[model samples]
Target: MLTTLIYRSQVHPDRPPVDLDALVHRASSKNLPLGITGILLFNGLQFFQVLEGTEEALESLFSEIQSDPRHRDVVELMRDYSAYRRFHGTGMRILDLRLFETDGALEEILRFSTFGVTEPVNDRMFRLLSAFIADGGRYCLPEPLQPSRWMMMAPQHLPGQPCQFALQAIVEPAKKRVSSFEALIRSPTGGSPVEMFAAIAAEDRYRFDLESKAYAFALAGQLPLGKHQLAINLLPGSLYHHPDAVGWLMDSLLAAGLRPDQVLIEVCFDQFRKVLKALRVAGMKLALTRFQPDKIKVDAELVRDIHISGTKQAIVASVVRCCEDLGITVVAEGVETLEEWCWLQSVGIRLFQGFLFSRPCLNGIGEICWPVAR
Candidate 1:
């Protein structure tokens, strides 16, 4: 028998707002197995939830939810045996819909949590639901994910042209203090990391991402950046197949006596969709190389900040606002001109990287040294 339930509750004053991503992480792991589907919203003050599952599953889950001390006065607005679930999505996406005030539409049958942004209208719930799935990075395949094939390769040693990295500085213009340095591959043949990877083939590049994780940990043990941090290049494959994909790498870093938080895991600008889910579960600091899309499941708060390229701004202002909404900071990259720098700052981005500030230093450095600023 299909069961549906709606309930509302007040946030406990002493407690912090509930972490919705963690809720989605836990709920996705549980609900999908029992064939449950629904939506939930939290307005930072109260939780309005809707759930559907087997009479057996809803009874079990709702009983536990009602008992959680995080909320008080769990009031059931409606309960019924439904013919089919109204929400078809497998992963129950929770939203913050506080911005949408209730006039009357849903006020009749429900009172709920709000994390949705939409134009005000009587069909507010419809818009709320639309944004939830579009921005909520909760949807995942129902079956267990298969591990991607992978391996590791350390940078080859060469005297004249070493297979090390061209280290470039990243920083906050507003604060004028150094943030971190990105390790751009300095190939022995003078090719960039992108070029070197292209020579190998497509799938092998992904394998390089997994390989880079181990390499990054080993490099972390070698570098004494001193109060600064290290940002390593990771392909989209870094987070995949297994939940432990990122966890094990972090364990390796910890064993080496490195601060895992300081070692920011940086992915290319376009790789957010692939890593967002794992990032929430791993609880690690992530930085996007430079990128966004609404359909992109961005648990943006799960990341530390973003690195935007300086070459374009025709479509960048929108991307910056999207990041602002995700609660993430933005750092413009590839900046070679003062004009580009000022343009990004006007769009609300304050951190930056590029030749206008400093070019990468790849020569006259060993496995470790200070990342000279310009």
Candidate 2:
């Protein structure tokens, strides 16, 4: 886990000259041995430092800094727990403090005088500052990056003839396994079935009908032989509003050489309880996607999996733990780094899909080269 500590000191406009150099030296001496690194910001009268490190090291440093006489009226702005560290190394890190001055001190400045105004002036200054930082900043190799991929599928029912649905696929250079897939619903006219369903629930009988049909088509004779399991996106409105349609789609799948075990029917997070229950009764495995676990109650036994983006790894992991207690497997979508993959694995997730693996392809017929490089 990671933690951040922000220490602020009151400004002293008229006091004995403070030895900035000596204070930095002392802080560095304390941090170097403990492996802590951070930046310090000072505005003439006030100073603030953002430090990141192990829990023990930070706690020790906070105690030590509190007694220093160079500053007073210290306040902690933020202290929180995190699952991952924001920085890689430890050192008494320092940054050249930046000061933004105002003629009125508290008044906003005119656009021309502001550092971020006007393209030409801002661009040149930004480039210069960026180069300076790049030249002087310490560099280290980050945790290995992971692969990710995205797939969009059209909804099931609309007014037009069956349009050729596009399945976009992408693959990474290293990890070459199919981890996850997001079955986005889009029609030939570029309209969302979910969106259309909201207004046409009473008038439209083909909302999820389109999705289920596409799901069957993809799983049936459409998917290439030897392809791994795939996720079929489903809308809650469709599931709750039409149980017979769901059954019909499952029947199509069974007729198309696909098994309930081979396909994961992902219910959009907004699906109703009745729809989810009906899906469970229809003999289709459930996967919760694009929704937080806390928002909905799921039957762990009925929901075999879940799909989440990489950015939500921590939150997803926690939710996955809860699902695990109920015997549900977790699948993290949009996984793009070895660190992310490793973290999810540690949290008990086995199935994954993202650009780290492969992008969606035409008709989901894409290549997957297994036993990926480490």
Candidate 3:
């Protein structure tokens, strides 16, 4: 399906000076092969882009954009299936609003706007563009110098053994510090969790998955976490397979100077709801991953661009309330937009995990990027 993604991001203040022409030339060349096309608008300090392409291509490019160090405060403003391409004849072009008069600039931007669409996201985009143009393009960037190629490369992985992983910090914005570190399973040679698990025998999968926590715990202990918690994901029913699940976990925590309460055990909501009883009995905290839609789980769909969707906003508000009343401390995961974070915060959620805060570090607790005042 053809997908449309509209987003805005601030230029990283501390990043090396950008070469817009060089960057656009590179991006256009890169996007063409993937059958992607878009318009990029930069207003000195921020970028507003509308991308149109295959779902997979747009998703992959967006992933790279999120990880790109040249930008910050990346807000995915809109995402939807488009019936047709708006920029059908264009590759990737830079739209300089400064070159046109205010009225002309607005018209240029409106050219891509869907005239008959009733979606608020579409309405909001035109409003934002009009506002920027009315401001006389105040923040429009000057021509950049120092042309250099800037492209992100994916991590190369090779087949390797199991039990290797990384830690990504779960941050608490209200507290201005990390609340926990979640283990991201990987292999010594860069194999992913799926690859590592696939290598295990079916009969031994549960044992291996349950036993891997020791490695994560041990690694986490070496870090100076202070009051921050350590989180680990487990396979469903793995605890039942282990003869001494509770005792073994306790021992591992003790050796690492971690108490049971300091650990947050995460399992999928659908798979391991009841299996978490043993962990809870041991005084460990618990969280349900992948909240399902209209259910007591983390629905990323409901969280995505929730600022613009009343339906999503209402659904998440009710879910958060339900979780709160039940004494479940809700942590909104996969939050990539400041608007989403603000909404979730207003709804009383304090913990969050996503690229917006920080990406996973290889065997370390990485730094958090707090939003700057606009």
lDDT scores in order: 0.56, 0.49, 0.69
Q: What is the lDDT of candidate 3?
A: 0.69
Give the per-residue lDDT digits (tens) of candidate 2, residues 1-374: 46767555544445786677777788777777776766565544555566667788788888877777776545454465544343334444444334333222112112112233345335332232233233311111112222222122232343353433334232322344443334454444545655534544565644645454654355335555345454565555555666466676777777777765555566543456556566556666666443322112222221222122222333555666777775665555565544444445544556655544545443345444332334
For residues 55-120, write the lDDT of model 3, one tens digit per residue.
999999999988888875565657888776666455587776547755676566556545345643
TM-score of each: 0.42, 0.46, 0.54
Candidate 3 Cα errors over 4 Å, as ranges = 1-161, 268-275, 288-297
Cα error, candidate 2, residue 143 (Å): 9.5
Model 1 misplaced regions, further than 4 Å: 1-163, 199-203, 241-243, 268-275, 288-315, 363-374
In model 3, state the lDDT of residue 284: 86
Model 1 scores worst on lDDT over the 10 consecutive residues at 144-153
Instruction: Tell me which of candidates 2 and 3 scores higher on TM-score.
Output: 3
User: Candidate 1 lDDT, tens digit per residue, 238-306?
Assistant: 566445667676676777667756666666435455566555455456663433321122222211121
Ranking by lDDT: 3, 1, 2
Top of the candidates by lDDT = 3
Question: Using alpha carbons, what is the TM-score of model 1?
Answer: 0.42
Q: Where is model 2 poorest over a 10-residue stretch in terms of lDDT?
A: 136-145
